Scaffold this active site. Sequence first.
Site, PDB file in Angstrom:
ATOM      1  CG  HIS A 106      34.361  13.661 -27.083  1.00 51.55           C
ATOM      2  ND1 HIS A 106      35.290  14.443 -26.431  1.00 51.55           N
ATOM      3  CD2 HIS A 106      34.200  14.211 -28.310  1.00 51.55           C
ATOM      4  CE1 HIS A 106      35.673  15.424 -27.228  1.00 51.55           C
ATOM      5  NE2 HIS A 106      35.026  15.306 -28.375  1.00 51.55           N
ATOM      6  CB  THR A 107      35.041   7.734 -23.029  1.00 53.19           C
ATOM      7  OG1 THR A 107      35.119   8.612 -21.900  1.00 53.19           O
ATOM      8  CG2 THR A 107      36.417   7.637 -23.668  1.00 53.19           C
ATOM      9  CB  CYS A 108      30.772  11.428 -22.213  1.00 50.43           C
ATOM     10  CG  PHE A 109      27.158  11.248 -24.960  1.00 53.71           C
ATOM     11  CD1 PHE A 109      26.707  10.689 -23.778  1.00 53.71           C
ATOM     12  CD2 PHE A 109      26.896  12.586 -25.204  1.00 53.71           C
ATOM     13  CE1 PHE A 109      26.007  11.448 -22.860  1.00 53.71           C
ATOM     14  CE2 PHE A 109      26.197  13.350 -24.290  1.00 53.71           C
ATOM     15  CZ  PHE A 109      25.752  12.780 -23.117  1.00 53.71           C
TER      16      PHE A 109
END
Length: 695
Positions: free
Chosen positions: A668-671
């Site tokens: 997950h590139t968000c975090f």
Amino acid sequence: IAEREAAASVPIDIVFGLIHMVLQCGNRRNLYRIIHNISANKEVRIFSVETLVNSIYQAVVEGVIAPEVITKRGFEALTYLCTKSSDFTTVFSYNTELINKILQATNKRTISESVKLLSTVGDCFNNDKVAEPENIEVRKYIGFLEYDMTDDTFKHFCEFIKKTDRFYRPMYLLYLMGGSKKSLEECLDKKAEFNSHTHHKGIIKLVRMLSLVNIMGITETYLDSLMELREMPFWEYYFNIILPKEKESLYASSILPLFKAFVIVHTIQMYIGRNENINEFSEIPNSDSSIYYSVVEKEKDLINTFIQADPDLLFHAFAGLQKKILDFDNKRIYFYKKIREDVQLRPTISLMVQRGAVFEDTFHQLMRLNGEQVRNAKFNIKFAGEEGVDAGGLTREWYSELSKEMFNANYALFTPIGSSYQPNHISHINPEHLVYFKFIGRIIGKAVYDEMTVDCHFTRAFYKRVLSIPVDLTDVEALDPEFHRSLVWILENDIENVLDMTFSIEQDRFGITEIIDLKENGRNIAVTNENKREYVELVCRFKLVRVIERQLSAFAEGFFEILDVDMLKMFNEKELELLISGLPEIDVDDWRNNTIYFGYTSDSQVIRWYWRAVRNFSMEERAKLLQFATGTSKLPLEGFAGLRCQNGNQKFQIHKASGGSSRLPTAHTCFNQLDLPEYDSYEQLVKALLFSLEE
């Protein structure tokens, strides 16, 4: 290059004595001039050449100067006379028995010069004047192939066979298959003790003549023989037993010819006839039983290693290989050297920049010219004010300033997502700013064509749309987590029973919400089980791209007016990040030193297996792992200490995926979160990582 006519100022009696004197004389370059001058007319020329070739014939067939030296000097004289004005091969075409004498008078030593003879002689067939190709005895010519030759000799052989294909295709092919069958049978008999270095000469001969077959192609009559010979178990046994031994025991250079020949045997194309003056109709064959794919998958790693050893193999040796086998490193190097063979005409232009605003001045000075001029432009950047660095440093500073200003807040062309960038919303970007996106496309195109690694880091959606790849759901997941969760919840479950939503999606425009139909008659269409994937992917495309679409479009014509589309579309979106932003060098030790773990420990067996896999990842695949896990190819100067995610700064974090062994890793590139599940073996873990990074 044409015939010249002169008066008969020389009688034919004295040329005999002249040639005999030249035979018993050195420093005949002046004599070369003399004979060229006296041979101005056609008749004396013909008599001189026939007398010289007859003398050479008697100098070997039936007998002062030694026969070897006299024969080689006759050959040198023939070369130096034929090489000028090209008019002497015309006599050869008129007679054509003298070529028969030449091949008859061709011993083990004659070949080194006879090849250069025939290479120039082949100009006689340029206008297709033979009148008796049947009485040439090219059988002995092709039988000479067993003789000991060098590279230039082989190239001249290629030239001559290209000239004489239309003349002697069938027996040429027949002798080719005969020689190939005998050579492979010899290899098969010694295959137990076969050494690619001890019998290197034989494998060289075989691969040479097989490449000659490829250049020639086969006919339908010999198609049966060709397909039969595409069924050699020698390939199987070698690749399964001896190749693993030869990889560690023998050098790759001597092993390459066998791979070359394995490519050859299935690379042959079909030739029917020389319909055009120089264009030959080539057709591709089929197979049913061949397992070349199994072999190429079996030893793909070391094959890629040997390709890394020599990049020129992909141009002449391994040109028939599929794109899938080649790794992004070798594939990208080949792409560089393929786009850069088209050097074209490059005009050097002096260009002016100012520290206050490089972007505007650069846009002005580059869009005055066209795409070809700018792609071929050698930018002579001269920064105003400070003049203390070379032209290369000035151009590098111009590159960096353009990269900084294209993401500038005042320009607001691209809003940052952290390390990477994306164009801002439709409202924020002015309609007039569409030209700047074409400018950015041009800038990145010329940076790639200049082999310059720029700091343009973007979303995977941008790269996908550049490469005409549909935008996947992970890109929207990066920007909107709840939207991605809702979409996956809709996709996975049988929601058609209680769906109660039409095909169109609402997107508020403050004043009112308009019904944007995602397709033809979209509003009247509801979402069903059959079209749930279509609905999800269309909503993914229309939730983000439809406010970024013309930025991508303008960048597309900007980027494709500097580079060729065909040689570009064959790459991946993850590979495009390394192509545009560059190939950074990432440290495994720095990656593992400042990476936090959730549900595991630094001494965890699976975590240690992951770190070992990162340790032995090659630069291609470790860069791809960095791109997949972190959502960007950008690396801070400090390393992983200052690495950031979309939502502020965040060091790399590994969480437990709480899944089975067959479950694939999820990032997950968000975090900067990588979901690492529980595995059972190291090899399974590394294969799962490879599949995740490749995608």
